[PDB]
Design a protein around this ligand. Structure first.
Ligand SMILES: [Mg+2]
Ligand SMILES: [Mg+2]
Ligand SMILES: [Mg+2]
Ligand SMILES: [Mg+2]
Ligand SMILES: [Mg+2]
Ligand SMILES: [Mg+2]
Ligand SMILES: [Mg+2]
Ligand SMILES: [Mg+2]
Ligand SMILES: [Mg+2]
Ligand SMILES: [Mg+2]
Ligand SMILES: [Mg+2]
Ligand SMILES: [Mg+2]
Ligand SMILES: [Mg+2]
Ligand SMILES: [Mg+2]
Ligand SMILES: [Mg+2]
Ligand SMILES: [Mg+2]
Ligand SMILES: [Zn+2]
Lengths: 106, 53, 69, 96
RNA sequence: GGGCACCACCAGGAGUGGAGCCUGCGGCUUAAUUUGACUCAACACGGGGAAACUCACCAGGUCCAGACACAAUAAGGAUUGACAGAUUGAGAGCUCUUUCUUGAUUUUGUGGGUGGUGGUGCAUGGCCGUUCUUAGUUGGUGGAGUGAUUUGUCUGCUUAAUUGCGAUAACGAACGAGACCUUAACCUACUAAAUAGGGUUGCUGGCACUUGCCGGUUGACUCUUCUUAGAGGGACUAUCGGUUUCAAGCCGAUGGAAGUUUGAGGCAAUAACAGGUCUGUGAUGCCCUUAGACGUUCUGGGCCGCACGCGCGCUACACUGACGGAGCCAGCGAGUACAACCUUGGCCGAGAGGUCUGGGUAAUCUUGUGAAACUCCGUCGUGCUGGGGAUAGAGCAUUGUAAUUAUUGCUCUUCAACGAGGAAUUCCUAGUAAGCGCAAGUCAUCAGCUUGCGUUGAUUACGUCCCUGCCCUUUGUACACACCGC
């Protein structure tokens, strides 16, 4: 009766990459099963967090450095689909590590 | 109990303590870590930061 | 290290000069009471004014009077 | 140590309610979270408790952590009045 | 004797050392100008660009944060508080003037802790640096020795490499190197997108005025080359030629995005050093200290002082320039809701900077960060000149509680030294060197520093042991705390 499409973006942010990919795949599969209009898994530029730190505590000896870094992986799945469907999706397909998140408002 | 036991320590080296040691020395305040650099190094792997290149 | 300076004069926290069953208040008859000095206007009765040469205060509100009595 | 006793009592009550206490390692802080008293005072109280058994303390990451032993609990009860079959976190409230 | 390396030298470049100025470190000075560290492996290091904080130093003051145990007061107060002015640097009750509060917390002792950017890194942990990113290290058999040990682990030739080929009482192995990983390069081949870019077309601006050219609009429709970033491939020294016991390999052409280990790193053995750090650390032994502290905390300074040494650095000695206009292109990034982040766009101001407004928690907004050095046309022409910009004086701004011992910016003014730097010595082999700016880091405010980034982009080798260091081998050794030896 409703069939009210709010236009819903699923964000998918993570560090672990393979896991994220798997999650995305799962989501896609779910969508296919439910048979909806959606834009495919858009992948955004991998933001890298860099922390340069002198390896030493005491600053004595040669001046050596360690670039410790964090990889951020950010994906978007845009669903032209209802509210109920979105809710259902949210309910099923949750894995550890990946930050599942929904915008909901076009 | 005494009245004057506080200079205004809103900002600067004195305000910004670290989470672990509570030091004002080599304080990584980037990305809201607030960690003395040594401490960060010791834990960096657990906090998601890995050496690659 | 460097040696300590030594002027000489030390100052200690005063012991307070404690006193109880103080000579404030009185009774003449027996039945009724006769208050000496006065009680606080700001707070309720039970607390009593400090009396000096045209200068008053009270301790429950640390020290907050001005008018004479 | 120099505590207005009411505050101390309040703190004790709070502890009892909890079955636990988490403080900062932050002296000069004007008022604690939850309790309407100075954090420093609370910390001092906790220390005192520890010194006469009762509480178990951890100082990790600028956060003091506190849990009550059986004896400690008993002491707290005595301080309060409350007799038996009471709060802390020694057992669940109902189903959680 | 034989190796290796632009932390060695050649062949060259850029230099530094001279000049001024920044900043480190001495020396002196000073209440105190806190401390750690001195060949490489101390000296723009302590992420150490100190205005207070930081901070450890000095002059001064404040505070207990003296846990707990046990007694002396135990309310005829234990001790807690305390406006008023003198007091006090001082709306520090710091107290002596005071005579009101405070109710057993305490407090007065005695056991007992606690804190200390106090000490000792030659008492330790962990981490780091260095021998060494060099090529080194080990054990299982078996052989040689009574034995410590040795051989394997090596004449030679290769290799960046104890890398391999070979020769062989040694055989097969492990670690280290390699492989590995990350990134930097290729994909008109896949999967993808109004948070990335285009094509047609709508409306629409201007042109020439024929159909055509540039545009502007998230109006439609469709695409994935560039974009990103998932999955894969792709290089293996490939094909050919020589050269080399026709081996390991090396040298040259061809193709190929890539033929220097494809480039760059990340990790990186055994054994160590009395290397550094007890001033990252509720990592810590012991000593010291331990309630007028060497604890803390306020306040004012100081790390920045100057006859003078060296060490990183910047700015220049101009004509390959300077100054004006004009042209006008990057990549790493980073960036706030409990705060005050980046901050376009509009108005004010010669500027700095103010204001209103937004957009952004971020491929969306700042941001195409239209960065500089560059390129074009003009003004000065080789004169301590318009090169050079120091010291200076003043005002205008901003950050903060506080700017004098200019924080920084801007405006005018002052125009010093220095015509390419002696003995010495650093760095370097390709998108490197050098130049040029950006960038975050620290950050309330300050970049001459730093980790990165891209832009412009060469000269000369592509070798050798002459020097320097290091490595092995053979030698000699009265050394073994090992030449700072005996
Ligand atoms: Mg002193
Ligand atoms: Mg060296
Ligand atoms: Mg300095
Ligand atoms: Mg340097
Ligand atoms: Mg400063
Ligand atoms: Mg300490
Ligand atoms: Mg200590
Ligand atoms: Mg040592
Ligand atoms: Mg030593
Ligand atoms: Mg044997
Ligand atoms: Mg051997
Ligand atoms: Mg051949
Ligand atoms: Mg490589
Ligand atoms: Mg952008
Ligand atoms: Mg001149
Ligand atoms: Mg700096
Ligand atoms: Zn009163």
């Amino acid at each position: 009766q409703e069939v009210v499409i709010h236009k819903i973006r699923i964000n998918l942010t993570s560090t672990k990459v393979k896991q994220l990919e798997n999650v995305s795949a799962n989501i896609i599969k779910n969508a296919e099963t439910f048979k909806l209009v959606k834009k495919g898994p858009v992948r955004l530029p991998t933001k890298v967090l860099k922390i340069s730190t002198r390896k030493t505590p005491n600053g004595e000896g040669s001046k050596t450095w360690d670039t410790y870094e964090m990889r951020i992986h950010k994906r978007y799945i845009d669903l032209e689909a209802p509210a109920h469907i979105v809710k259902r999706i949210t309910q099923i397909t949750i894995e550890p590590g990946v930050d599942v998140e929904v915008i909901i408002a076009a | 109990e005494n009245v004057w036991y506080s200079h205004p320590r809103k900002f600067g080296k004195g305000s910004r303590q670290c989470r672990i040691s509570g030091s004002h020395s080599g304080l990584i305040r980037k990305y809201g870590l607030n960690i003395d650099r040594q401490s960060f190094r010791e834990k960096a792997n657990d906090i998601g930061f890995y050496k690659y290149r | 290290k460097k040696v300590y300076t030594t002027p000489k004069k030390i100052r200690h926290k005063h012991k307070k000069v404690k006193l109880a069953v103080l000579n404030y208040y009185k009774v003449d008859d027996e039945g009724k009471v006769a208050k000496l000095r006065k009680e606080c206007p700001n707070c309720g009765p039970g607390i009593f004014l400090a009396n000096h040469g045209d200068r008053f205060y009270c301790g429950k509100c640390h020290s907050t009077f001005a008018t004479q009595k | 140590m120099l505590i207005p006793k009411e505050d101390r009592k309040k703190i004790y009550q709070h502890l009892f309610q909890e079955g636990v206490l988490v403080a900062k390692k932050d002296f000069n802080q004007p008022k604690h979270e939850e309790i309407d008293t100075k954090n420093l005072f609370v910390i001092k109280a906790l220390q005192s408790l520890t010194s006469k058994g009762f509480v178990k303390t951890q100082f990790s990451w600028q956060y003091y952590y506190y849990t009550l032993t059986e004896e400690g609990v008993v002491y707290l009860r005595e301080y309060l009045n409350l007799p038996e079959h009471i709060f802390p976190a020694t057992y669940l409230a109902g189903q959680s």
